[PDB]
Amino acid sequence: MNIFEMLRIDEGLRLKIYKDTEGYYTIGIGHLLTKSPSLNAAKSELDKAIGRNCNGVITKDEAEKLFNQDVDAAVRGILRNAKLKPVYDSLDAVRRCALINMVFQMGETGVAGFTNSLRMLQQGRWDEAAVNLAKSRWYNQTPNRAKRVITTFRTGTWDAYKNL
């Protein structure tokens, strides 16, 4: 299992604009297009992002290309971030994927706000951190996915996804 497979499980693949659980316009593998209500604003962002007139629809290849970009950008964002970098550096390879997953979903800034959990992860206090991470809107709003990520941080294995 790797970061791409992990996120492909959590986000799914959709080739037509769709709304995410928060109600935002998304396409492909969890690629947020805009927080704006306008489907039109969404279609424009899409064409801008693909470099073609997509008319709200894209090919598998295009979705995978966006995915590669988003993952790369998530990783680089963590590495550039003063709060995130030290945590990342302190984790094993599986747990690193779990932090990338959170960043992909909620952005650098949002994850950077998990001050207390970050601190626990850095100190390698797995169980404590799992319990703190669950006390979030994040967990309450998308509990199945959050549980998967949380279990990854707790155990350091891919058990949560080995099911899936």
XYZ file of N, CA, C and O in Angstrom:
656
model
N 0.837 -1.153 0.000
C 0.000 0.000 0.000
C 0.883 1.217 0.000
O 1.981 1.157 0.534
N 0.430 2.300 -0.620
C 1.194 3.529 -0.679
C 0.249 4.703 -0.604
O -0.946 4.506 -0.582
N 0.770 5.900 -0.544
C -0.054 7.097 -0.445
C -1.127 7.215 -1.526
O -2.286 7.585 -1.238
N -0.763 6.909 -2.771
C -1.740 6.994 -3.858
C -2.908 6.027 -3.731
O -4.070 6.392 -3.969
N -2.598 4.786 -3.366
C -3.629 3.780 -3.187
C -4.495 4.136 -2.009
O -5.690 3.973 -2.062
N -3.867 4.631 -0.946
C -4.557 5.042 0.260
C -5.565 6.125 -0.056
O -6.749 6.081 0.331
N -5.092 7.141 -0.736
C -6.015 8.253 -1.037
C -7.042 7.874 -2.084
O -8.141 8.416 -2.051
N -6.663 6.977 -3.028
C -7.639 6.535 -4.019
C -8.814 5.827 -3.311
O -9.991 5.940 -3.670
N -8.519 5.151 -2.215
C -9.578 4.511 -1.452
C -10.444 5.523 -0.744
O -11.660 5.462 -0.776
N -9.820 6.503 -0.116
C -10.586 7.490 0.656
C -11.412 8.514 -0.136
O -12.392 9.057 0.352
N -10.964 8.820 -1.342
C -11.600 9.844 -2.154
C -12.460 9.293 -3.284
O -13.389 9.951 -3.709
N -12.091 8.135 -3.809
C -12.785 7.535 -4.910
C -12.364 8.215 -6.196
O -11.531 9.091 -6.162
N -12.946 7.827 -7.329
C -12.652 8.425 -8.634
C -13.933 8.822 -9.306
O -14.787 7.994 -9.490
N -14.068 10.060 -9.699
C -15.259 10.492 -10.373
C -14.804 11.314 -11.559
O -13.917 12.127 -11.382
N -15.347 11.060 -12.757
C -14.959 11.752 -13.986
C -15.870 12.891 -14.398
O -15.647 13.520 -15.447
N -16.895 13.155 -13.577
C -17.830 14.243 -13.839
C -17.867 15.111 -12.575
O -17.742 14.535 -11.493
N -17.992 16.482 -12.687
C -18.015 17.341 -11.492
C -18.990 16.776 -10.526
O -20.029 16.261 -10.922
N -18.675 16.869 -9.261
C -19.579 16.351 -8.284
C -19.422 17.147 -7.048
O -18.511 17.965 -6.959
N -20.314 16.967 -6.092
C -20.144 17.713 -4.869
C -19.528 16.797 -3.843
O -19.894 15.637 -3.736
N -18.585 17.327 -3.092
C -17.974 16.562 -2.041
C -18.896 16.521 -0.787
O -19.971 17.109 -0.746
N -18.486 15.872 0.277
C -19.348 15.814 1.439
C -19.630 17.158 2.015
O -20.602 17.267 2.729
N -18.750 18.144 1.795
C -18.957 19.500 2.354
C -19.854 20.329 1.464
O -20.227 21.433 1.774
N -20.156 19.747 0.321
C -20.982 20.395 -0.642
C -20.182 21.111 -1.685
O -20.759 21.833 -2.474
N -18.859 20.936 -1.727
C -18.117 21.639 -2.758
C -17.871 20.858 -4.025
O -17.762 19.634 -4.035
N -17.766 21.635 -5.096
C -17.522 21.154 -6.448
C -16.086 20.593 -6.551
O -15.086 21.319 -6.302
N -16.047 19.294 -6.917
C -14.884 18.444 -6.994
C -14.964 17.602 -8.271
O -16.005 17.450 -8.880
N -13.843 17.070 -8.692
C -13.741 16.155 -9.825
C -12.543 15.214 -9.580
O -11.692 15.469 -8.748
N -12.485 14.104 -10.271
C -11.369 13.179 -10.174
C -11.230 12.511 -8.839
O -12.215 12.002 -8.283
N -9.984 12.510 -8.343
C -9.682 11.871 -7.074
C -9.583 12.906 -5.974
O -8.506 13.279 -5.555
N -10.715 13.403 -5.535
C -10.791 14.404 -4.482
C -10.193 15.780 -4.824
O -9.758 16.501 -3.954
N -10.178 16.176 -6.104
C -9.593 17.455 -6.487
C -10.618 18.555 -6.318
O -11.540 18.663 -7.139
N -10.483 19.351 -5.265
C -11.418 20.438 -5.020
C -11.377 21.480 -6.110
O -10.337 21.997 -6.438
N -12.485 21.837 -6.664
C -12.411 22.854 -7.710
C -12.633 24.267 -7.165
O -11.853 25.175 -7.412
N -13.708 24.453 -6.426
C -14.011 25.760 -5.882
C -14.964 25.626 -4.723
O -15.797 24.711 -4.733
N -14.870 26.547 -3.766
C -15.814 26.539 -2.675
C -17.059 27.294 -3.054
O -17.999 27.307 -2.288
N -17.050 27.924 -4.237
C -18.185 28.673 -4.749
C -19.367 27.803 -5.194
O -19.246 26.700 -5.747
N -20.550 28.363 -4.989
C -21.803 27.719 -5.312
C -22.038 27.589 -6.779
O -22.851 26.790 -7.223
N -21.373 28.404 -7.550
C -21.651 28.336 -8.961
C -21.022 27.179 -9.712
O -19.813 27.106 -9.831
N -21.866 26.328 -10.282
C -21.407 25.220 -11.083
C -20.635 25.767 -12.254
O -19.773 25.119 -12.891
N -20.983 26.994 -12.567
C -20.318 27.642 -13.675
C -18.918 28.026 -13.261
O -17.972 27.760 -13.987
N -18.797 28.593 -12.068
C -17.484 28.892 -11.545
C -16.671 27.590 -11.547
O -15.477 27.580 -11.837
N -17.344 26.473 -11.229
C -16.704 25.162 -11.197
C -16.237 24.738 -12.544
O -15.151 24.163 -12.688
N -17.049 24.976 -13.562
C -16.612 24.513 -14.902
C -15.448 25.263 -15.500
O -14.675 24.721 -16.284
N -15.370 26.512 -15.111
C -14.323 27.402 -15.520
C -13.000 27.021 -14.843
O -11.935 26.969 -15.464
N -13.071 26.732 -13.557
C -11.884 26.324 -12.838
C -11.342 25.054 -13.456
O -10.144 24.889 -13.662
N -12.259 24.155 -13.746
C -11.934 22.876 -14.369
C -11.179 23.010 -15.682
O -10.131 22.384 -15.877
N -11.724 23.817 -16.590
C -11.071 24.051 -17.882
C -9.677 24.686 -17.702
O -8.717 24.380 -18.419
N -9.607 25.596 -16.739
C -8.366 26.255 -16.389
C -7.338 25.199 -15.898
O -6.197 25.115 -16.325
N -7.787 24.337 -15.025
C -6.959 23.288 -14.510
C -6.543 22.239 -15.548
O -5.462 21.670 -15.440
N -7.379 21.937 -16.546
C -7.050 20.902 -17.550
C -6.400 21.471 -18.799
O -5.616 20.829 -19.499
N -6.722 22.704 -19.082
C -6.152 23.338 -20.243
C -6.921 22.991 -21.489
O -6.381 23.085 -22.585
N -8.189 22.600 -21.285
C -9.131 22.267 -22.345
C -10.568 22.620 -21.979
O -10.846 23.015 -20.846
N -11.468 22.541 -22.953
C -12.881 22.776 -22.668
C -13.407 21.438 -22.267
O -13.472 20.512 -23.083
N -13.686 21.293 -21.004
C -14.063 19.961 -20.555
C -15.523 19.762 -20.449
O -15.983 18.626 -20.393
N -16.211 20.878 -20.354
C -17.594 20.778 -20.224
C -17.908 19.821 -19.060
O -18.682 18.881 -19.184
N -17.277 20.043 -17.906
C -17.558 19.236 -16.681
C -17.166 17.772 -16.671
O -17.449 17.028 -15.732
N -16.469 17.347 -17.693
C -16.091 15.969 -17.698
C -14.645 15.808 -18.104
O -14.170 16.561 -18.950
N -13.966 14.822 -17.493
C -12.564 14.552 -17.759
C -12.312 13.071 -17.942
O -13.125 12.259 -17.549
N -11.154 12.731 -18.522
C -10.752 11.348 -18.732
C -9.950 10.858 -17.517
O -9.458 11.674 -16.735
N -9.811 9.525 -17.391
C -9.048 8.857 -16.330
C -7.651 9.453 -16.204
O -7.173 9.763 -15.118
N -6.998 9.613 -17.337
C -5.674 10.180 -17.407
C -5.540 11.543 -16.801
O -4.530 11.831 -16.153
N -6.542 12.383 -17.076
C -6.620 13.742 -16.577
C -6.802 13.743 -15.078
O -6.143 14.507 -14.377
N -7.668 12.845 -14.588
C -7.863 12.719 -13.157
C -6.586 12.265 -12.456
O -6.252 12.721 -11.352
N -5.881 11.357 -13.087
C -4.659 10.905 -12.499
C -3.572 11.952 -12.526
O -2.705 12.011 -11.636
N -3.593 12.775 -13.530
C -2.596 13.830 -13.593
C -2.839 14.826 -12.456
O -1.917 15.204 -11.735
N -4.108 15.230 -12.271
C -4.456 16.158 -11.194
C -4.036 15.563 -9.837
O -3.534 16.256 -8.948
N -4.250 14.245 -9.695
C -3.962 13.528 -8.497
C -2.466 13.628 -8.231
O -2.013 13.983 -7.148
N -1.669 13.320 -9.243
C -0.218 13.411 -9.058
C 0.156 14.799 -8.587
O 0.972 14.971 -7.695
N -0.470 15.812 -9.174
C -0.146 17.169 -8.737
C -0.516 17.476 -7.316
O 0.208 18.171 -6.655
N -1.678 17.005 -6.874
C -2.184 17.314 -5.559
C -1.383 16.652 -4.470
O -1.175 17.215 -3.357
N -0.919 15.429 -4.811
C -0.107 14.664 -3.843
C 1.244 15.386 -3.698
O 1.720 15.652 -2.598
N 1.834 15.754 -4.850
C 3.120 16.403 -4.828
C 2.991 17.700 -4.058
O 3.789 18.036 -3.180
N 1.951 18.427 -4.356
C 1.791 19.673 -3.673
C 1.564 19.470 -2.171
O 2.038 20.297 -1.347
N 0.827 18.393 -1.797
C 0.593 18.142 -0.353
C 1.913 17.874 0.354
O 2.172 18.424 1.409
N 2.732 17.006 -0.244
C 4.035 16.678 0.338
C 4.934 17.921 0.514
O 5.498 18.173 1.588
N 5.063 18.698 -0.563
C 5.879 19.918 -0.557
C 5.344 20.916 0.457
O 6.088 21.616 1.130
N 4.029 20.965 0.589
C 3.452 21.894 1.549
C 3.857 21.554 2.974
O 4.166 22.425 3.781
N 3.835 20.261 3.289
C 4.220 19.787 4.623
C 5.678 20.147 4.879
O 6.051 20.601 5.952
N 6.504 19.927 3.862
C 7.936 20.158 3.992
C 8.354 21.585 4.146
O 9.417 21.815 4.689
N 7.507 22.491 3.651
C 7.682 23.936 3.698
C 7.043 24.527 4.935
O 7.205 25.694 5.263
N 6.259 23.742 5.601
C 5.573 24.273 6.707
C 6.308 24.110 8.025
O 6.688 23.022 8.387
N 6.502 25.201 8.749
C 7.257 25.167 9.991
C 6.695 24.287 11.076
O 7.431 23.698 11.863
N 5.392 24.166 11.097
C 4.760 23.340 12.088
C 4.670 21.907 11.671
O 4.641 21.007 12.501
N 4.490 21.695 10.379
C 4.289 20.331 9.924
C 5.569 19.526 9.713
O 5.642 18.334 10.012
N 6.564 20.179 9.160
C 7.838 19.536 8.867
C 8.458 18.686 9.987
O 8.891 17.564 9.766
N 8.544 19.232 11.175
C 9.155 18.503 12.278
C 8.404 17.273 12.631
O 8.993 16.289 13.039
N 7.078 17.335 12.515
C 6.267 16.137 12.821
C 6.516 15.077 11.787
O 6.715 13.909 12.084
N 6.462 15.517 10.534
C 6.687 14.618 9.424
C 8.030 13.904 9.591
O 8.135 12.675 9.516
N 9.065 14.700 9.843
C 10.398 14.130 10.000
C 10.495 13.152 11.120
O 11.374 12.308 11.124
N 9.637 13.309 12.102
C 9.717 12.443 13.241
C 8.970 11.147 13.083
O 9.113 10.262 13.910
N 8.196 10.995 12.001
C 7.377 9.759 11.806
C 7.985 8.678 10.942
O 8.787 8.993 10.072
N 7.504 7.428 11.123
C 7.882 6.314 10.261
C 7.176 6.491 8.911
O 6.361 7.411 8.704
N 7.451 5.620 7.969
C 6.852 5.789 6.660
C 5.338 5.653 6.547
O 4.746 6.282 5.659
N 4.704 4.808 7.382
C 3.247 4.628 7.287
C 2.532 5.830 7.844
O 1.611 6.384 7.225
N 2.996 6.255 9.017
C 2.415 7.433 9.664
C 2.568 8.694 8.855
O 1.721 9.594 8.899
N 3.655 8.744 8.108
C 3.860 9.870 7.211
C 2.708 9.948 6.206
O 2.182 11.047 5.908
N 2.294 8.761 5.701
C 1.194 8.748 4.767
C -0.085 9.260 5.408
O -0.890 9.893 4.732
N -0.279 8.961 6.699
C -1.457 9.419 7.344
C -1.459 10.936 7.474
O -2.501 11.560 7.411
N -0.292 11.555 7.675
C -0.266 13.011 7.775
C -0.504 13.573 6.370
O -1.159 14.596 6.233
N 0.036 12.915 5.312
C -0.202 13.438 3.970
C -1.711 13.433 3.628
O -2.276 14.385 3.031
N -2.386 12.350 4.037
C -3.802 12.171 3.802
C -4.601 13.334 4.403
O -5.403 13.968 3.727
N -4.339 13.655 5.662
C -4.983 14.786 6.345
C -4.733 16.103 5.612
O -5.621 16.904 5.383
N -3.491 16.328 5.235
C -3.147 17.530 4.517
C -3.848 17.616 3.154
O -4.296 18.654 2.744
N -3.952 16.518 2.438
C -4.621 16.507 1.173
C -6.094 16.903 1.342
O -6.654 17.630 0.570
N -6.717 16.431 2.400
C -8.126 16.656 2.652
C -8.440 18.009 3.241
O -9.369 18.651 2.860
N -7.670 18.425 4.211
C -7.962 19.626 4.899
C -7.020 20.800 4.735
O -7.214 21.835 5.332
N -6.032 20.667 3.868
C -5.064 21.733 3.662
C -4.111 21.900 4.838
O -4.437 21.565 5.953
N -2.920 22.410 4.547
C -1.796 22.656 5.461
C -2.230 23.404 6.710
O -1.936 23.092 7.890
N -2.936 24.452 6.414
C -3.433 25.298 7.446
C -4.364 24.580 8.408
O -4.294 24.751 9.616
N -5.270 23.790 7.885
C -6.166 23.149 8.796
C -5.495 22.147 9.706
O -5.840 22.005 10.882
N -4.566 21.400 9.131
C -3.891 20.376 9.903
C -2.985 21.051 10.905
O -2.910 20.633 12.084
N -2.334 22.144 10.430
C -1.446 22.900 11.322
C -2.143 23.379 12.587
O -1.504 23.581 13.624
N -3.483 23.458 12.543
C -4.254 23.818 13.722
C -4.435 22.667 14.734
O -4.967 22.841 15.830
N -4.014 21.458 14.385
C -4.165 20.359 15.324
C -2.933 20.343 16.230
O -2.238 19.353 16.326
N -2.666 21.466 16.868
C -1.520 21.714 17.739
C -1.219 20.591 18.692
O -0.138 20.009 18.708
N -2.208 20.288 19.495
C -2.035 19.259 20.501
C -1.767 17.846 19.979
O -0.959 17.122 20.552
N -2.483 17.457 18.911
C -2.308 16.153 18.309
C -0.927 16.044 17.692
O -0.321 14.984 17.781
N -0.474 17.134 17.013
C 0.840 17.209 16.347
C 1.952 16.947 17.353
O 2.892 16.172 17.148
N 1.791 17.591 18.488
C 2.735 17.492 19.607
C 2.820 16.047 20.080
O 3.895 15.494 20.261
N 1.667 15.412 20.215
C 1.627 14.023 20.637
C 2.237 13.117 19.601
O 2.974 12.186 19.915
N 1.954 13.382 18.345
C 2.534 12.529 17.315
C 4.041 12.690 17.355
O 4.774 11.736 17.228
N 4.514 13.922 17.560
C 5.926 14.096 17.594
C 6.588 13.356 18.745
O 7.708 12.847 18.669
N 5.879 13.265 19.834
C 6.469 12.567 20.921
C 6.235 11.106 20.855
O 6.605 10.460 21.815
N 5.601 10.617 19.773
C 5.314 9.208 19.580
C 4.306 8.620 20.584
O 4.362 7.442 20.953
N 3.355 9.433 21.021
C 2.335 8.956 21.941
C 1.085 8.641 21.111
O 0.158 9.457 20.992
N 1.106 7.471 20.476
C 0.081 7.054 19.548
C -1.354 7.030 20.014
O -2.235 7.562 19.366
N -1.573 6.357 21.113
C -2.878 6.210 21.684
C -3.415 7.552 22.120
O -4.583 7.868 21.903
N -2.553 8.378 22.723
C -3.031 9.652 23.176
C -3.415 10.508 22.017
O -4.409 11.216 22.049
N -2.604 10.452 20.980
C -2.900 11.262 19.825
C -4.209 10.835 19.089
O -4.948 11.685 18.581
N -4.465 9.520 19.007
C -5.652 8.969 18.365
C -6.921 9.503 19.034
O -7.856 9.949 18.384
N -6.899 9.510 20.366
C -7.980 10.040 21.179
C -8.131 11.549 21.002
O -9.231 12.050 20.978
N -7.040 12.302 20.867
C -7.182 13.730 20.660
C -7.652 14.082 19.226
O -8.422 14.995 18.932
N -7.147 13.377 18.264
C -7.561 13.683 16.915
C -9.065 13.496 16.718
O -9.642 14.151 15.848
N -9.680 12.549 17.471
C -11.110 12.237 17.321
C -12.034 13.351 17.791
O -13.210 13.429 17.397
N -11.469 14.239 18.602
C -12.201 15.409 19.117
C -12.094 16.548 18.146
O -11.468 17.578 18.474
N -12.672 16.358 16.973
C -12.583 17.372 15.947
C -13.815 17.353 15.071
O -14.474 16.331 14.942
N -14.079 18.464 14.432
C -15.154 18.527 13.502
C -14.897 17.478 12.426
O -15.782 16.710 11.993
N -13.617 17.430 12.036
C -13.120 16.478 11.019
C -13.645 15.072 11.242
O -14.183 14.458 10.327
N -13.431 14.565 12.467
C -13.856 13.239 12.843
C -15.368 13.137 12.870
O -15.979 12.185 12.398
N -16.000 14.114 13.465
C -17.490 14.096 13.539
C -18.176 14.211 12.177
O -19.218 13.626 11.907
N -17.574 14.961 11.286
C -18.158 15.066 9.978
C -17.901 13.879 9.024
O -18.759 13.552 8.210
N -16.699 13.301 8.995
C -16.399 12.171 8.077
C -15.766 11.097 8.866
O -14.614 10.813 8.647
N -16.523 10.556 9.800
C -16.038 9.532 10.711
C -15.413 8.268 10.113
O -14.467 7.786 10.685
N -15.912 7.688 9.002
C -15.292 6.453 8.496
C -13.856 6.636 7.996
O -12.937 5.845 8.274
N -13.691 7.707 7.224
C -12.398 8.060 6.713
C -11.462 8.501 7.867
O -10.313 8.051 7.975
N -11.960 9.416 8.732
C -11.187 9.858 9.855
C -10.727 8.659 10.672
O -9.578 8.620 11.047
N -11.596 7.670 10.918
C -11.220 6.490 11.675
C -10.117 5.714 11.031
O -9.229 5.161 11.721
N -10.180 5.640 9.700
C -9.125 4.932 8.985
C -7.752 5.580 9.189
O -6.726 4.912 9.448
N -7.748 6.917 9.086
C -6.510 7.714 9.221
C -5.964 7.661 10.640
O -4.751 7.522 10.885
N -6.905 7.749 11.569
C -6.587 7.704 12.966
C -5.949 6.382 13.320
O -4.934 6.357 13.984
N -6.536 5.275 12.853
C -6.000 3.914 13.077
C -4.617 3.754 12.507
O -3.807 3.008 13.051
N -4.379 4.415 11.374
C -3.068 4.400 10.739
C -2.026 5.063 11.687
O -0.910 4.548 11.911
N -2.403 6.183 12.312
C -1.525 6.860 13.263
C -1.328 6.061 14.540
O -0.268 6.089 15.160
N -2.385 5.373 14.960
C -2.360 4.577 16.172
C -1.459 3.367 16.083
O -0.664 3.098 16.966
N -1.645 2.617 15.014
C -0.933 1.385 14.816
C 0.276 1.464 13.919
O 1.140 0.631 14.010
N 0.356 2.377 12.998
C 1.544 2.314 12.202
C 1.525 1.188 11.162
O 2.556 0.861 10.580
N 0.356 0.618 10.881
C 0.215 -0.413 9.855
C -0.904 0.010 8.891
O -1.566 1.005 9.100
N -1.148 -0.773 7.854
C -2.186 -0.486 6.899
C -3.419 -1.282 7.180
O -4.261 -1.445 6.312
N -3.551 -1.788 8.379
C -4.733 -2.572 8.675
C -6.063 -1.986 8.229
O -6.926 -2.715 7.737
N -6.254 -0.686 8.465
C -7.520 0.003 8.185
C -7.952 -0.027 6.763
O -9.135 0.064 6.454
N -6.970 -0.159 5.911
C -7.196 -0.159 4.493
C -7.083 -1.519 3.879
O -7.247 -1.621 2.671
N -6.742 -2.529 4.681
C -6.515 -3.873 4.152
C -7.751 -4.715 3.922
O -7.804 -5.729 3.230
N -8.753 -4.166 4.506
C -10.117 -4.521 4.419
C -10.648 -4.266 2.982
O -11.071 -5.147 2.228
N -10.580 -2.952 2.699
C -11.037 -2.091 1.602
C -10.574 -2.346 0.155
O -11.375 -2.140 -0.809
